[PDB]
Amino acid sequence: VEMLTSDATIEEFPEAQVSPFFKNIDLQTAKQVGGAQVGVPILVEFKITMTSNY
């Protein structure tokens, strides 16, 4: 779904953390899709990439 930024290969330094098991790289993108007169979604489409553990 090419609303999305691309990619999946990099090197990561931690800023903040909540799951000890997951290394999210970043919220790669996010765009609030409104819709039209035919219908809504209104919400925030997004994309993330994440390496887990082990």
Binding site: E2, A36, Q37, V38, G39
Partner: protein, 54 residues
């Protein structure tokens, strides 16, 4: 000279207050706008394309 008022016809104000008034206006007028605002917009979309081409 002319006195606290002047004499009685009043005098002479037929020159002062006829090469005056003015023309006043006074122009109780040309102040600040709210302007006004237009409205948006008519769709619901339709599909042919872009379903098959993505």
């Amino acid at each position: 000279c002319e006195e606290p008022p002047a004499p009685a016809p009043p005098p002479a104000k037929p020159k002062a207050a006829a090469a005056v008034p003015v023309k006043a206006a006074p122009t109780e007028t040309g102040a600040q706008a709210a302007p006004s605002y237009s409205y948006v917009y008519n769709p619901v979309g339709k599909r042919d394309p872009f379903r098959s081409p993505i």
